[model samples]
Target chain A: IEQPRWASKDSAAGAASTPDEKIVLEFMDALTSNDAAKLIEYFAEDTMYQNMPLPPAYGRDAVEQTLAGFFTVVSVDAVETFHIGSSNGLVYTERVDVLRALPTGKSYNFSILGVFQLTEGKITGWRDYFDLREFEEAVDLPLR
Target chain B: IEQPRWASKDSAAGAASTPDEKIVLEFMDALTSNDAAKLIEYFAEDTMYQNMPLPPAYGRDAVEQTLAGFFTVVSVDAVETFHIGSSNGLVYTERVDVLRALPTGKSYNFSILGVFQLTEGKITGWRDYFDLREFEEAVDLPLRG
Candidate 1:
């Protein structure tokens, strides 16, 4: 089984020092665990989460439900973040996410640019931008 | 007619200072001009440009052709850069591109994350990541179907 890079013991050796980076990293750690319950803890009660071109999952409860459904179908293998930056209090990350479908066990990977908004140390807005066609083809599903 | 934000007289007042940022800003300026000829100058002869999930236009000539085709269909209204950073000599930009279709005169906007790899001050690799469904819906075209 391929393990997420951040799941390794030495993953925090070169960890980012900023609080915002630490929050996002922690969120990614929770995400890699495939525990939507823990993941939602990083979001505020009214957080808005969206995977671009798809209907947004508004609020913590809805976001948890959306994530639970997604994790049920696919298991994340890795999230390789290439770059991270912040401007005007918004954090942006460039990453390549690798996942395996639970039903077929086939793997797929795609690049993503995520924008996150944090308020009082809690994520208030999260939007991921990627090629939707890539996801549909990889998952063998019609999303649009 | 809505003008691009970068086209404003005070646009460069808060311009970025890094060389990589300048190069990207210049490239965006050329792109906003809708002049593929001027845009290609920012790329190296062997540059590879890909709009993610789409076939890459390898080399300058092919990239020029691709850009020309795209420009013919839509005119760029503005490219708003939200964040920019560099790591391992690669510059990445998070932006929202606003464009107007020439045929329908309808405006569309989509967010993009662009990665640029430069060598000797010339762009060698450029890849743009965006939601393809957004483009298809905005343009009313079936890209995969």
Candidate 2:
């Protein structure tokens, strides 16, 4: 609610360009292209990748594992991501249009948004926000 | 990743005010207040309201009818919205939490993004995006998984 969205035309000129935009664009490109290695290059060495499906993955090692897990899921699970916003060195993303989960025939529609805090050129601090209860329902897991 | 996020610090400083924000706030106020009359005022005269529970309501009268039908199954349904973006007088709201079918105990946490078009301060168009298949499970409906 920081600003009313209805008054958008005036905001045309207010659009400012920041490094995070390019980085997020690159990230989205990697996802769309299924380029895991190129995707890893934009993240900081010790960057934290936290998201809705799992907990935080720290540093290069964790990133590798995280992406590997992510790519593996994409390999078999139905998955897609929608980019929401690129503002203030942060990006808001949405996960959707998925027919994921092999042998399970499980499909999900809930999406999440991530706030990536970039430093210098690479993404350093990433704070992922999504509801666990929502995930349970989306994934049909027992509610807590 | 145009610049850095920090570069747009307070980028919303010159944010233009609009009635849609207040209308949204008013809608929320009514939800908490259970004041359907007041909430109905903000909807366009010929607004079309389509939701998870029922078919589309093409006019204001139908909108009321639709909401009434929904209010029956669920005593309370509230919405908390986050502004995502706006363009061409269209307001984008991303709701991280949505309360649905309260008494039926079919409520599930969901993140939904809506694109609303406001014409002269009234909601003229609206579209809701979420995983409907996931929603079926959330409501205890049948699902493969």
Candidate 3:
């Protein structure tokens, strides 16, 4: 069950400054800016990226292929980080990401709870959790 | 990227002694026991429960109705709690749940990271995260690939 979302005010720290946080922030920027090279820079060669409900994409090449197709269809509009917690190089994030799907140029606002593992400032693992129904609904997939 | 699932070693204190932990433990037990009444007992009358990707269900009545059909078709076979973190009545859980469907007796296993808010030992809100496509695979749905 999804809990009620807490506002950004919950993080009295204002913002995070870990190397991993900086990398993730840039990763977000790359999504909006369409900077493929920059986006790929934060990931390790053996990166494993899973956008939940989808099969995990393995290695740098697979990750690039996955994001390349996605980048063409969607553009990050805005990202508001609501909460962040980190321990031993693993970072947990709660954020609201706004995106525009190119087909209709329609905006979908959804929340994600992400768990990322970083090594030497590069993301080795990235798992993001969101609602697949929300995605399908936003993209206008026909109901079965 | 699928992070390697961590064993319960995250908690080295031999498990939590907090009231929140107690509530979640009972909550899990109630699910496997096929006891909807006992399960809902830990929830507030106005509790909000959401299984991500689905719209949220609110109130005890709605929660009961939702679980009634589910309990009949499926049973929780196993649940392994990996990590549990709490603050100010809010509890975060990372675990893998194993399940079996009654009719065909098919099995499915998935991981979830849950957030729960407890008020006076009753769950006021609960949210869970899992892979829906994986669920579709578990149920033998055709995929685009």
Candidate 4:
């Protein structure tokens, strides 16, 4: 699957994130902060994570490995705020994750439309779509 | 946002069009047929619609106007395949919608990830995304003059 026509601004964030922004914001915070334990806690052990431009990060162990590897390659600075969805009681976020890591130096921005399935305030499953170019180029880099 | 991805899906038949799916499916179905009246029934009269290269579609009337204008371009043959969420209650659809019309003599297909909200078993709100470059190249047409 490529992405929705509204991936950037017209995502879950725009459609319904006013109330659920907290959860989405929290997830990103933990991700960029490299808080492995905290980040893993929000996601289900069997969570299926598809982080485009790479293999699927399946299960909690897989996610931790992916995170550790990615951090080694790049360091996320800030995840920019855009729009989010928290309607129907599901928390969602459409934000550009800002990163200042390598291959390419300096900070970059990438947009991700994250769909989070929450059970008792803890995320059960997570799926996200981001600009593919951001993979080779840093998050803040221009679309090639 | 510029769509850089593309896929083809069918949702016109046997797609279940479940309560949640129904909302998003019906909206796309309405778009496929360009049935503005039926489309309006699902959204709030003053609902705000946002997406694409332009500003958000402000209200129902504006949405209809925009839809009418879009209707002039092409017709769709939609199909929804491979959907999963939880308990048959809420979720998203990975769909393939074929576009055919004078817009281009050759038919083209566009893939989209559509997010939706259902109220009273009807679609009350929604947002969607897909790759623009992939679409233009597929349709063999430029999005802008």
Please give the DockQ score of every candidate, comma-separated.
0.32, 0.08, 0.27, 0.11
Q: For residues B1-145, what per-residue lDDT tens digits would candidate 1 score against the true structure?
A: 2332222232231446578767887776667898888888898897888776567778899999888878878788888775565544566666778888788888878777676878788998888788876576555333432
Best by lDDT: 1
Candidate 4: which stretches are off by over 4 Å?
A: A1-22, A35-38, A52-55, A81-89, A133-136, A139-144, B1-25, B34-75, B79-111, B115-126, B131-133, B143-145
**Lowest lDDT 10-residue stretch of candidate 4 chain A:** A10-19
Model 3 chain B: lowest-lDDT 10 consecutive positions? B136-145
What TM-score would you report for chain A in candidate 3?
0.83
- Give per-residue CA lDDT, model 3, range B1-145, as digits (tens): 2335433354412375677876786676566776677687888886888776466778999887766656766777877666565543456666667877776778887777676778788888887777565555444322222
Q: Would candidate 2 be rated incorrect, acceptable, medium or high by CAPRI criteria?
A: incorrect
lDDT of 2 by residue, B59-144 (tens): 67767765554454443355654444444455545454444664467765555545455678786655454435445444433322
Candidate 1: Cα lDDT at A100:
81
Tens digits of lDDT, candidate 4, A1-144: 234333344443334434345666767667777656557777766665655324566677887766666676678777755555443444546566677766667776555556565656665556665434335654333333
In candidate 1, chain A reaches a TM of 0.84
lDDT, ranked from best to worst: 1, 3, 4, 2
* lDDT tens digits by residue: candidate 1, A20-131: 8668866765667888887888899978887774678778999998888888787888887655655445566667788888888888777776767788889988888888
TM agreement with the true structure for every prediction: 0.70, 0.55, 0.72, 0.56
What's the count of clashing pairs in each model shown?
Answer: 0, 19, 9, 35
Query: Where does model 1 exceed 4 Å of error?
Result: A1-17, A86-88, A119-121, A137-144, B1-19, B44-47, B57-62, B72-74, B77-92, B99-108, B117-124, B134-145
lDDT of 4: 0.53
